[PDB]
């Protein structure tokens, strides 16, 4: 990062938050904090979440998601480059009418990934938990895109790459930003 | 990023972030923050935001005991995940001021450990971890209103709760609604 403040701090002064990496707990804590800080500075003005992310932790993503929905300002989402997995879930979570992607940006949806090791009973618990996590994701995505839960289930069964235009048709975004 | 790093800025508003695995460094930092905040103002609420998979029991108890010791109420807010010791700390917030966000995940289970060596050494380690578990369970009983027997059963294996479920259980008081 060059200096103007580092570039991301300078953008944060204009209410721009960068989600530009794999989503883990540190990234989620930072974005949550940024969202709350911006709301405290001004509860009415829009916030802009720029997304270039392959996804990552579901619980970390939900921290971000819930924070977005909790605060009063509208959070615009703008996909630049890539929004995959939880990144695409967060793209879709922006304020309705203010979810964008750039023309050549790539959007990918798929089912959650995990693991389980141990006794049959332990594997059962882990399986139940990841299946319930998937139901939760699908239900929310349904509400945010207008697609049925059954369609989301089918379309996320394997890696599904969308163009920006396709993401708009799907209801993951509202507009493709044109130059 | 910087506005003063974001966490230091939040600390000025009496917000402490428990956003990682709980080890000794994390516990020392949180303890210190709690004490510092009490020294700045002994009456205003403190806010402990939790997104943690848990970690060391002794480290978690340092945080727990510090929370109970100081005069200000410590609100707890689960954002994302509170598992193991993280959920124990979530439950340890001031009564009426324990929250979770709607899609946050709460998990409770029994403590984990290991022991290697002579029979006698294994016995000592077993006794110690059993005593630790009884202590955790008893405290959770008091803080949630559930019986010790119910806590024992419900922590026997990994038990995932929704925010609403955690509220029904008595681990939190309210689900924060947007």
């Amino acid at each position: 990062i060059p200096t103007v403040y580092d570039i991301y701090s300078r953008l944060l002064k204009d209410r721009i938050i960068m989600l530009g990496s794999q989503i883990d707990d540190n990234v989620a804590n930072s974005i949550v904090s940024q969202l709350l800080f911006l709301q405290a500075q001004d509860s009415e003005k829009d916030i802009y979440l720029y997304i270039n992310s392959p996804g990552g932790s579901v619980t970390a993503g939900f921290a971000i998601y819930d924070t977005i929905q909790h605060i009063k300002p509208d959070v615009q989402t703008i996909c630049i480059g890539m929004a995959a997995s939880m990144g695409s879930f967060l793209l879709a979570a922006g304020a309705k009418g203010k979810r964008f992607a750039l023309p050549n940006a790539e959007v990918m949806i798929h089912q959650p990934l995990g693991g389980a090791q141990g006794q049959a009973t332990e594997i059962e618990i882990a399986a139940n938990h990841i299946l319930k996590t998937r139901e939760k994701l699908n239900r929310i995505l349904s509400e945010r895109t207008g697609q049925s839960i059954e369609k989301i289930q089918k379309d996320t069964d394997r890696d599904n790459f969308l163009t920006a235009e396709e993401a708009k048709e799907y209801g993951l975004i509202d507009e493709v930003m044109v130059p | 990023p910087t506005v003063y790093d974001i966490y230091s800025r939040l600390l000025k508003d009496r917000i402490i972030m428990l956003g990682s695995q709980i080890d000794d460094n994390v516990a020392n930092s949180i303890v210190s923050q709690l004490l510092f905040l009490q020294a700045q103002d002994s009456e205003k609420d403190i806010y402990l935001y939790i997104n943690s998979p848990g970690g060391s029991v002794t480290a978690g108890f340092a945080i727990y005991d510090t929370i109970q010791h100081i005069k200000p109420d410590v609100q707890t807010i689960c954002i994302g995940m509170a598992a193991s010791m993280g959920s124990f700390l979530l439950a340890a917030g001031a009564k009426g001021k324990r929250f979770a966000l709607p899609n946050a995940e709460v998990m409770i289970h029994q403590p984990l450990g290991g022991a290697q060596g002579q029979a006698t050494e294994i016995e000592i380690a077993a006794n110690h971890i059993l005593k630790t578990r009884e202590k955790l369970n008893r405290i959770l009983s008091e803080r949630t209103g559930q019986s010790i027997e119910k806590i024992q059963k419900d922590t026997d294996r990994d038990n995932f709760l929704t925010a609403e479920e955690a509220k029904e259980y008595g681990l939190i008081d309210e689900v924060m609604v947007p």
């Binding site: 924070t67 | 009496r14 609100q75 001021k97 966000l101």
Partner: peptide
């Protein structure tokens, strides 16, 4: 998260 925390 205000109101009320903070």
């Amino acid at each position: 998260f205000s109101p009320x925390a903070p």
